């Protein structure tokens, strides 16, 4: 019950499993090794308190009935960041309407909940602010930009030499850029001016002789670069869902089934998928969303009536 040429998406930490499982560009031993090294290297790049605490929490904010949208939220975060004097960032573009994730310092966090609770008591009760359960590192932000170079070194240690670019071309969706992995001057320029990439400038210089010369090598370098920078770059998961749900005409990848592979005790990506479907930009799109544990019978096609 597993189709072959299906494309590879995922959240930015399950993205490694999205490379390893459905494409086979590497294998699970190097996958688990890379995963344990990035965990142990994420753990030791923040000066924290010796009793485990830090000056960094994050929170799910809900722009519901408080009149925020895509053109207003980053200006809102920058304005409250200038008002508080702290670093406040978007980290996870989860849902278009009512689920964003803001990571910052604790003082900016209480400023955020102050403005959110006063707009809440203005417009009606919504519980528009929920601080994160437990975790205390500002993921995918600017303050993680040394471990990305050390992780690039460990990535060049781990990942094998010869790469097959056709195993991911037209099949892979990263998270720092929500577009298909395609060998393009526009693609390498877009990652280059989104995040400065010091070994990519030689490819940004010339590629026409290098498409003739180094296809596997060049795809390997841009792959390890784009795979290393998502440790500190925020995700664009709203635009990934739009790129997956807008049909083939009016260009975008038009898909039919959206199956997420996670447990049934918390189907979070399936919940985000159903919320984006029931969002009123479209109500006629028949995109069947499955969990691999809630919908096991209809996934393996072993159900009667």
């Amino acid at each position: 019950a597993f189709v072959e040429g299906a494309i590879a998406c995922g959240h930015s930490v399950g993205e490694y499993t999205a490379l390893a499982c459905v494409t086979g560009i590497y294998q699970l031993e190097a996958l688990l090794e890379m995963v344990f090294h990035r965990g142990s290297k994420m753990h030791d790049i923040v000066p924290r308190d010796e009793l485990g605490r830090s000056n960094y929490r994050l929170a799910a904010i809900r722009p519901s009935q408080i009149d925020l949208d895509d053109a207003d939220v980053p200006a809102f975060v920058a304005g409250i960041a200038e008002s508080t004097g702290e670093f406040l960032e978007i980290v996870n573009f989860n849902l278009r309407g009512s689920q964003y994730a803001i990571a910052g310092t604790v003082r900016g966090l209480e400023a955020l909940e102050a403005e959110v609770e006063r707009r809440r008591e203005l417009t009606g009760g919504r519980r528009s602010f929920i601080l994160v359960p437990g975790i205390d590192v500002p993921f995918h932000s600017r303050v993680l930009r040394v471990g990305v170079a050390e992780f690039r070194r460990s990535l060049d240690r781990v990942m094998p030499r010869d790469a097959d670019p056709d195993l991911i071309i037209g099949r892979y969706i990263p998270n720092l850029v929500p577009r298909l992995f395609t060998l393009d001057r526009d693609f390498i320029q877009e990652i280059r001016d989104l995040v400065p990439a010091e070994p990519l400038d030689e490819i940004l210089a010339d590629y026409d002789t290098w498409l003739r010369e180094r296809p596997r090598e060049m795809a390997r370098t841009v792959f390890i670069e784009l795979l290393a920078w998502q440790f500190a770059s925020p995700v664009r998961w709203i635009e990934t869902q739009d790129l997956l749900f807008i049909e083939e005409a009016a260009g975008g990848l038009g898909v039919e089934r959206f199956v997420e592979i996670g447990v049934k005790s918390s189907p979070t990506v399936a919940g985000l998928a159903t919320n984006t479907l029931k969002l009123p930009e479209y109500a006629h799109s028949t995109v069947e969303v499955l969990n691999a544990e809630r919908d096991a019978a209809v996934l393996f096609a072993t159900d009667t009536d």
Binding site: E256, R257, H284, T286, V287, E288, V289
Partner: peptide, 9 residues
């Protein structure tokens, strides 16, 4: 044929 509900074509 299609009738809009949650099945692929």
């Amino acid at each position: 044929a299609t009738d809009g509900q949650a099945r692929p074509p």
